Symmetry: D3
Subunit: 236 residues, 6 copies
């Protein structure tokens, strides 16, 4: 029935953007939350680390002439916005969700705390991690590996705009094939794009396997959770 | 020389958007900052309260489907992003600035604390207040009034897309006139929309005068603080 | 049986003062807590926003020559004292209660957080909100509307020294009559005293109805909760 | 010239009450502040620990019926109120003052942090410590000792309703004498109540000398810091 | 069956040191946690205040030339380390444990809060109090009395390297006898070593009885909890 | 005169241990501090990131049996202890220093905040960063890089038990040579272990140059900041 009991779902801000060129598209987020809700109702404990690219865009231009760290702090503030909207959407579906921020925040969100988050998962709630790792110069993928290892998740579900890992950029090379399973070293030796070095190393060092898939492809989240053939499995 | 020593300048997030559809427009924010950097060098202590309408656009549509309290929190997060961008802008021009948030932030900003805010104002720095009043259901203009009165500002400068208060909409009828100066009661009596009732009410009770004025027009700010004829002055 | 499931009870500090000229009168608070306990045991979820006038009195005089904001901060510190004593009194009756402060406090009380407070209500505990809205220049009534709207309460129970809304000050006009029901506009058109403008506007804008009643009039809290004829109902 | 450079002055909340039955008496607080403003201008770094007995009166009766830990917390809240009032008083006389709380406060005060407190003392400001030790069951005098030793104060000044330590109660017998100077051991041996045992014990272990003295008597403070004959000196 | 329902177990850092000359000895802590686990599974609610002498040793030498307060802060940081390891050890045995610090800490531990800790005990979890009282110049024993009184524990279990209270130092006087029961005054009159004055006074003033025993003596924790003859009972 | 104006000096906890088996060795810490106190007086702004290996030794054995996240937290607590000891050392030599923690601490230290850290650096103070990145699974060297780049340091000084990077281990073969200067890519290509990959990767992306060098050797630090030939320089 269920292959992965506890998962850390990594969603980029862009995933909530749909076709729009900025922000959150109501239809996309509803479709996404609903799909996550489905696996939760199947009893899966879900942890979500969400990015802020969809909202950073509106401030990307100015970022250029800003101190990178500061630009990154705005990015983190952007994730919190997606975290909030994401939670609101779950409550609408009858699923309770809690937002834990890596940087302490008064009323918008609870501060990250391992014991509480684990509990929340157990209590059947979706835990949404905001503000990445709390530090600049680190990617969302990195924050996903960190929270994943901390939450003792069975695997990290890296959701992307491609339904898996290809021998080469499929969107620009129709003859590209999707790997069904690959190793960390293989991914490296083959210069395959899975995630940034730092995040990749963290997943290895913590023995956190990764499944790359395309969330927007209706039904694949459930397929991966159930063990069907979907996306690429990267293991150590 | 100087008409107003300490001023609380209210900036809508939209005033940093320029002609863009969303976010922060580089040339616009650089222009606005520069103009304030001008009065600052003239010995004016300036506190800023900024909205998040420009960034809120990308999540506005979704907001409608969300709880309002949660929507306002996203609005407050948006203002933090503008506050950082603004703060960084000032540094580039050699001016020192600090970001105070109504809600506690870990490393993005310092929590609001009157004694320190006033402290900075004396040290001749720019203080940008973010997160508004820290509470949902309150408008940015109310935050400005709150902070303006708390900071013991000589006047609140309401920057807007108009150079003053008119007896009628000039854009949709070039036959009206720009009030040079009105009184709170007259404004209310003549249904002149200066700001929402709560915000407006606070200024009166704290006896904080307002000066509505378009900041896009170069020189406008420089004019108001010097005492020239510019924008409407709502006083008591 | 029960007309209002979730209520925000607004108690002024003076209500806990009884006949004494300052502070908390043991007999009054016990009578008050007991009455609130009764409706909780009937299954009503109660949220309480409490004032500090009864304790502010001792420092009222000095306040006069103090900066208003500072005077207001003392008021907020006063509510926390009533919040504490109020909680202690419930624990004595076997009812668990939690104090959420609008301003973060280390060990005296938990910081306000919407998700937790809602939960507390559901868990059958009385939630007592202290420190108003966290900002100076705002009344307790305002803090009651805010928390009320945030807690999604069915109605706000404004407890006062009069058993309802009269055509004129009853304590000084024996021929005054009590309205059984009135509208927001009616209350305004008639210059009826319900609460301050800001708080009143917030209740309207959030569609939070109000029931004005006299808590000290033994048995009326239960009567209002049950639907009997008691106090004045102000709705939009 | 100056006998004590840095001093930790202990003020009971009652010493701000004057002849009133409760709260803060305007003329009294203005008198007391003024007297300290005097030694401050003389280059004395002054830290203050204030009790809350004056405000605690209005809730004392109820306290008896409450848990003691909770009662002490209300006592600590009371001290914050006096701290603010005191702080404001100093500003009026042109003196800068900061309020450090043992327990974290959001905007009412700054959390205690030694490096900053000492910082202020050097900057020639008045530092008023509130919330005592931050723990229930500890007396105000213990907080004074704690802070006195932490601040590396030359001496702790215990202001009281008496101008010194006597061989017997002078009020209830005008035949005793005011010890000019005693030693901790002598005090204990002769059962001279200077302060509770814990507080007293701390001063000795940290080697912090005490100077009991009535502050109501004009000039008293001025006398002690200058070295004149005034109040008992408990030393080691 | 069970004589003490809720206990505050005071463990010195040295107890976790075993024979080693520094730090935590895996075997000792496992033996200790297991023994505590046994009484928890019997339904006893356990509160633990732990010291840091075992880890302070490594920095004792440098402490000598440091400001005492600072030296004490390092001690508190040391308790947190034992608190952490202590918790980890319980989780391994299947017993949930929470670490509450007297000084607020972001992700390492929850800040001390009476309502939550009581709850935790009730929920069957072991609560471990770290950082003493939060202030320098106070012993661990003192922190044990404080938390004990706050948690309304039935008795404070002072674990030590001696199996009770002797007529004189047994390790250096073979003819020393163990008291089975003694009074506070008796302990004092006889100059018996139970704990430091401050801590002792606090236990008396709060009517918190004390049982002195040797935790390392396998099986005595259970014996004391069950009412058997073990250790010395000090009561008021 | 000065080669590097602002430097981020990385100190392993072991470098404060001297020849001892654990903890902090008085003569060693006094020597190391003194050496830095030297370059500071020369107008060099110095930020420090210190590890906790020296203190972690006493809990290392137990760590193996604990969850790694929890082990790393104990490691971070250890670094706070070294930070305090270090800070105190500087005071003794008349130098002012402040301790910034990645994780919020109540009174032991100030929470990390870039604007203030840079503030201090300009005020000519020593800033000691503790708790590393604030996240588990990240090495001390990564924290150094993070902070180094955040602080806009001219270079990161990696103090170690070796005076530079060699073509081969000199200790286990006196036939190699100390690279005078290498480039990131060369280092990686030649498998020269300078620091873990993540840490190393960050320095390159932020363009932060490293200068590996043994600090035990008196004069070493003094040499590097002046520009003399000392230790390997890994640049881009």
């Amino acid at each position: 029935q269920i292959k992965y009991k506890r998962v850390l779902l990594k969603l980029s801000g862009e995933s909530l953007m749909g076709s729009d060129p900025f922000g959150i598209n109501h239809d996309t987020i509803v479709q996404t939350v609903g799909e996550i809700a489905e696996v939760v109702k199947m009893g899966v404990q879900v942890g979500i680390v969400v990015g802020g690219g969809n909202i950073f865009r509106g401030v990307s231009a100015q970022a250029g002439s800003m101190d990178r760290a500061t630009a990154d702090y705005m990015g983190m503030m952007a994730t919190v916005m997606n975290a909030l909207a994401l939670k609101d959407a779950f409550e609408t579906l009858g699923i309770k969700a809690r937002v834990q921020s890596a940087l302490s925040m008064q009323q918008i969100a609870e501060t990250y705390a391992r014991p509480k988050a684990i509990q929340y998962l157990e209590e059947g709630k979706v835990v949404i991690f905001a503000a990445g790792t709390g530090n600049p110069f680190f990617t969302t993928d990195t924050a996903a590996a960190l929270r994943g290892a901390e939450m003792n998740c069975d695997v990290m579900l890296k959701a992307t705009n491609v339904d898996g890992v290809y021998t080469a950029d499929p969107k620009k090379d129709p003859s590209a094939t999707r790997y069904e399973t690959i190793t960390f070293d293989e991914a490296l030796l083959k210069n395959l794009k899975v995630m940034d070095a730092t995040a990749f190393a963290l997943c290895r060092e913590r023995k956190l396997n990764i499944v790359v898939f395309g969330i927007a492809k209706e039904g694949s989240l459930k397929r991966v959770i159930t063990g069907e053939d979907e996306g690429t499995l990267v293991h150590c």
